[PDB]
Amino acid sequence: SVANRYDLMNDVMSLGIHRLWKDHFINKLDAGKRPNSTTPLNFIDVAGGSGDIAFGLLDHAESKFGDTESTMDIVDINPDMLKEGEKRAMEQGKYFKDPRVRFLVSNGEKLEEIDSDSKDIYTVSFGIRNFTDIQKGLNTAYRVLKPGGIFYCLEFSKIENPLMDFAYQQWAKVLPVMGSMIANDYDSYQYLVESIERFPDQETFKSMIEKAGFKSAGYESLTFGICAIHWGIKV
Amino acid sequence: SVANRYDLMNDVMSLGIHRLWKDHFINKLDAGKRPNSTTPLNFIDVAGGSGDIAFGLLDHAESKFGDTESTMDIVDINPDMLKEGEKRAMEQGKYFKDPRVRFLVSNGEKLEEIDSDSKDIYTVSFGIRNFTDIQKGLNTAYRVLKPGGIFYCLEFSKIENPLMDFAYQQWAKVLPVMGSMIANDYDSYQYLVESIERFPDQETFKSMIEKAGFKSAGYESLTFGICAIHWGIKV
């Protein structure tokens, strides 16, 4: 199971703390059809096929706003990931065979199957660092949102403090060595560490988001900047 | 959820490989009433109240031998761990409210509620290193088992590959540091590292097993001795 591996890797990298970042990410977004409204919202979640963010967005909308009508497209380029999503949906007995929830194979940079100006909320969580073309992803995220749409991102970022950054770098050195020796999994851990290293820092990423067309771009650094929430608004 | 924290920490320490050590442990024991036999086995599993190993032992017996009769005493000194085991059993739809499987609170070093010479298989999986008196827990294992009973133990051990040892030493230094920085939890990770360091090596632990009175004792080192399986047979 590929999704089991990503979960494992995320748990190892962040010592389980990514679960709390995600909880925060959802709470902060505070998205959903208000009891004062009759228009249901249209969600899209990209590059998290196994669905922990998508389901949590939906769960949050239900328990806090009574929203049970908002739709959700869960999109990933990896079919295996979406398969694990559906399986988890079946096993938890929620969002499996649900008209509201669609699982779709699609390239995160193109999203051809999705209509321009169709979406209200776009989320990408710990996936965008692996896009071969990050800007094209952000541009594409601009396309599919409606005016007044919100782009929300959770991704690894840059640690500001030198002492913490130094510790993290030693952690990033040892991680692929341990993986190799213990799990014959050098390549996976090396790619993970490199994709974090290569990812733009808070300010650079915010600019790339404004360059895509989004306005009132901001970010909140979490756990000293080991990761960050970025946002944007379409026109 | 105390059981999920142990799971998380085991995943992090072993990079998920403890799951494979656990499968190998169950498969190597190969316990269960054979089809040309009519005698159910009486299993006792100590200090794994969540029931990871106990459920797996029962599953293995059923899928491989058709054994649906053997009994299992899941024993843990922590009622919260057993509580999680019962919750998992209910959510699985297996081993919950099931006369075959008892969840019992008891100090694993004493097992006072457990009768002498009543068990066929004793298993302890990543628990015995945290016994305040290990020899006492071994003697108790000897007591509860029948003549011919098997003591089977999965535990961290002494690494026997110098290169793996060198990598591990770096790992054990930086891990609790990440615990401090990311998890605000130095203590748990350092306690884990120290608990492993204080455990007897393969040969010393074998001796202790023999000291308890077990015969034909042995061990198999896993992943260069990062952990090991130890066994003993009652008289």
Query: Which 3-state string (H, E, C) describes chain A?
Result: CHHHHHHHHHHHHHCCCHHHHHHHHHHHHCCCCCCCCCCCCEEEEECCCCCHHHHHHHHHHHHHHCCCCCEEEEEECCHHHHHHHHHHHHHHCCCCCCCCEEEEECCCCCCCCCCCCCEEEEEEECCHHHCCCHHHHHHHHHHHEEEEEEEEEEEECCCCCHHHHHHHHHHHHHHHHHHHHHHCCHHHHHHHHHHHHHCCCHHHHHHHHHHHCCEEEEEEEEHHHCEEEEEEECC
Q: How far apart are CA B221 and CA B219, in angstroms?
A: 7
What distance in Å separates residue B167's CA from the closest CA in chain A? 7
> Among all residues of chain A, which has the CA nearest to that of B189?
A15
A107 is in an annotated binding site: yes
* CB within 8 Å of B184: residues ≥ 6 apart: none
Residue with tokens 């988890």: A88
Residue B42 CA to residue B145 CA, distance in Å, equals: 9
B176 close to B76: Cβ distance less than 8 angstroms: no
CATH architecture assigned to B1-235: 3-Layer(aba) Sandwich (3.40)
Resolution to 1 decimal place, in Å = 2.2
A184 annotated ligand binder: no
> By a Cβ cutoff of 8 Å, what residues of chain B touch chain A?
8, 11-12, 14-17, 163-164, 167-168, 170-171, 174, 177-179, 181-183, 185, 189, 223-224, 226
- Candidates A110, A124, A123, A129; CA nearest to A205 is A129
**Least CA distance to B168: which residue of chain A?**
A178
**Method by which the coordinates were obtained:** X-ray
Residue of B nearest to A168 (CA): B178
Taking an 8 Å cut-off on Cβ atoms, the answer to whether B8 and A15 are in contact is yes
* Distance from C-alpha of A49 to C-alpha of A28, rounded to nearest angstrom: 21
Residues of A with CB under 8 A from a CB of B: 5, 8, 11-12, 14-17, 164, 167-168, 170-171, 174, 177-179, 181-183, 185, 223-224, 226
A178 vs B167, B177, B181: nearest CB: B167
Could you tell me how far CA A9 lies from the centroid of its own chain? Answer: 15
Distance, in Å, from the CA atom of A157 to the CA atom of A200, rounded to the nearest integer, reads 7
Answer for the pair A202, A157: CB distance below 8 angstroms, yes or no: yes
- Is A50 marked as a binding-site residue? yes
B106 burial type by CB count under 10 A (0-12 exposed, 13-18 middle, 19+ buried): middle
Chain A, nearest residue to B15 by Cα: A12
Q: Is there a contact between A178 and B15 if contact means CB atoms under 8 Å apart? A: yes
Binding residues of B for S-adenosyl-L-methionine: 50, 76, 107-108, 125
Contacts of B170 in chain A (CB under 8 A): 170, 174, 177
Residues of B with CB below 8 A from A181's CB? 163-164, 167, 224
